[PDB]
Amino acid sequence: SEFLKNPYSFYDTLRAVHPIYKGSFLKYPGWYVTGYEETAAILKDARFKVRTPLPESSTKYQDLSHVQNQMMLFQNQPDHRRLRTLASGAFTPRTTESYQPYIIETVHHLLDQVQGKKKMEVISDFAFPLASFVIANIIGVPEEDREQLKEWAASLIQTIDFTRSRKALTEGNIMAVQAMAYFKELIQKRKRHPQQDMISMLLKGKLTEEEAASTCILLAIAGHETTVNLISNSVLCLLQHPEQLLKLRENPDLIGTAVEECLRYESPTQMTARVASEDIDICGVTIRQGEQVYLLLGAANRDPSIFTNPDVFDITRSPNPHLSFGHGHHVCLGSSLARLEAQIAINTLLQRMPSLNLAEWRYRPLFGFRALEELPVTFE
Amino acid sequence: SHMSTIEERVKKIIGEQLGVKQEEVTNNASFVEDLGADSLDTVELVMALEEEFDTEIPDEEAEKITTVQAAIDYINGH
Ligand code: HEM
Ligand SMILES: *P(=O)(O)OCC(C)(C)[C@H](O)C(=O)NCCC(=O)NCCSC(=O)CCCCCCCCCCCCC
Ligand SMILES: [Cl-]
The missing domain is CATH 3.30.43.20 (Uridine Diphospho-n-acetylenolpyruvylglucosamine Reductase; domain 2)
Incomplete structure (x- = not known):
């Protein structure tokens, strides 16, 4: 605590x-x-x-282990490059830019539902729904199944964390069975009738159907957990520094440099x-x-040897070579998507809620991620 | 019959965790070498012991224990 x-x-x-x-x-x-x-x-x-987040030869959680060990995040050469390259098509600069219409549209739809309420919980009302709708749309998960996806993500993210327990891993194994079975069926559907989504891209190509499934699960998890924390951590940061919040409000073109400093200051991972x-x-x-x-x-x-006054929040830092998305071969595959989701969400929020204010913030019991339990705000 | 002793409670946890038969869980037996505990088993074993005896075992103290008897000794002394 x-x-x-x-x-x-x-x-x-x-x-x-x-x-x-x-x-x-x-x-x-x-x-x-x-x-x-x-x-x-x-x-x-x-x-x-x-390496694998559970012992290589462990069969205590057989299904959880099998799903984990297939993911590119825990694969080395040459399997890593093969898996990453195949998934990369959906996250190129150009493809990411094509998501902007749906993201902007979703942002406005969510802000509409709370606009007259004078109050909102940033995470459950805004941050989570946005990230969830976006990644599910990209992968190709229908709206009817997106609540199941939320459940699997929240459960599976715990299985890699220092704070995990026997009951968390037992639950994780159950969710691994459900998620793998579901994506296998969805892949069979897309195989017969391809659609405009990432799963069908994976079928075009190689890649086993289990590998395609575990790839979908990885991306679903990352889309549901880290991006939500980025948006919510950023809002709290800005509200705790009204000087630079006002600066950002006065010029939205500063959203780029602002989001980079939020990434450095309160890193989601x-x-x-x-x-x-x-x-x-x-x-x-x-x-x-x-x-x-x-x-x-x-x-x-x-590190003060790189960032002169490190504990000072300064949106004007340039450049900002933070390590929030990692570094090297495994560097975040979806960093452009995460940045876009955050930039659009924060700018639009500040635009539509001009008198935004904070309503003792608690963090989720995870040691590998910095995640707020909730973030209540008031406006208008 | 009798209420579960310290020794019996420790051995039951080890047996349930490592799926190993009792009386194969002898005193003086090593967790890694004899009982085949891997790099998760040993973490989960400490967690299970911490809950069973309602106590916190520091990482320093856990590192000292490599045998069944040593685990029994620690719980009796704390
Ligand atoms: C929906 C958006 C996101 C997607 C789709 C996504 C996806 C991924 C994937 C597939 C990888 C594995 C790449 C590989 O192993 O080659 C990865 C790595 C990573 N991601 Fe993301 N991610 C997202 C958002 C984020 C956010 C917001 C953060 C936090 C700032 C983050 C932090 C990281 C880090 C630090 C790694 C490297 C981990 C390592 O090297 O062990 N990701 N991401
Ligand atoms: P043995 O000697 O066999 O044990 C070795 C192991 C590896 C099990 C370790 O001793 C161990 O258990 N360590 C603690 C667990 C651990 O190391 N976890 C990894 C910490 S975080 C990590 O490696 C990368 C995750 C951060 C990247 C975020 C990407 C976006 C989120 C996706 C999560 C998808 C997970 C399903
Ligand atoms: Cl300030």
Whole structure:
């Protein structure tokens, strides 16, 4: 709870000892990295491999493991490049720009439903519905099934986090069965009758039908969790700094640089991980083969050797080489989509709700993500 | 019959977690070497013990324990 309110003081005490810190947290021993240059170096180095978030040969949660281990996020060469390239078509600059009409339309539709209420909960009323409708439309999930998708995403995201439990993993296995079965059926439908969606793109091409399913699940999860946190974290940031909120309101063209600073200051993803595939010397320490490396992206974004006054929120920072989307080969596939969703949501919100105000914010019990439980606001 | 002792409660947790038969869960047996606990099993074992005996086991103390008897010793001393 004390860590959730302000994790950056905890990151600072680690950084003061060493930017690569040998320790153990929540029963997980390894190297915890808070330094920017150390984080960037590790992510860029292919000798630090991604790995399965549960033990490779574990069959305690057989279905959960099988779904997890097929995802590009946890695959190395050469399987990673194959999987990523096949999914990349839906997330190119040009394709992402073509989503703008639907995003803008969805944003206005959601703001319409609360416009006369003088109150809203940013997450459940705005942030989540937008991100959910968008990703489901891209993948090709009909509106009738999008509530099931929300359930699977929320359950499966927990299964990779430090805070996971036996009951979370047991639940995750059930949701893995449901999600895999569902997408298998949807793929069979699209195989007979292709539509204008990502699933049909995957069938054009190679890629097994299970791999296509697990790809859909990965993208559904990322679309439902992180993007929602980006929007909600940003709104809170701006409202806590009225000086720059007013600045942004006066010129919406600053939304680009503003969203980048929100990404740096309250990073939706606080952690990713690697395993050392061999002995590696970095920053004066030796990481032995098989040892685990935990990269604290939020902490690296507060490195004073890169960002002069790191704990100051400043939307005018240029450039802003934050590590919120990671770095290297696994760098976020959907970063352009996330940025667009956030830019349109925040600008339109500030435009339509000119007197926006905050209504003791609690964060979800996740250590690898920075996610608000809710964000009530008042306006007009 | 009798109420479950510290030893019996510990051994039951180990047996249920590792799917291993009792009396194969002997004292002096190693979790990793003998009972075949992997890098999740050992985490889930500590969680299950923490809940069973309503206690917090520091990461430092968990690292010291590698055998069944040692786990029983820790719970008796705390
Ligand atoms: C709907 C929008 C999003 C989609 C579709 C998406 C999708 C993905 C995918 C498929 C990957 C794996 C790429 C690979 O392994 O080659 C990935 C990686 C990653 N994503 Fe995103 N993502 C989205 C939003 C976000 C947001 C908002 C953040 C937080 C700022 C984020 C943070 C990351 C990070 C840090 C990685 C790299 C993880 C690692 O290297 O281990 N993503 N994303
Ligand atoms: P053994 O010696 O067999 O155990 C090794 C393992 C890997 C199990 C570790 O000891 C371990 O259990 N570690 C704790 C769990 C862990 O490392 N989790 C990974 C932390 S985060 C991560 O690796 C990347 C996730 C962040 C990227 C966000 C992308 C958008 C969200 C999508 C989530 C999709 C998940 C289904
Ligand atoms: Cl301010």
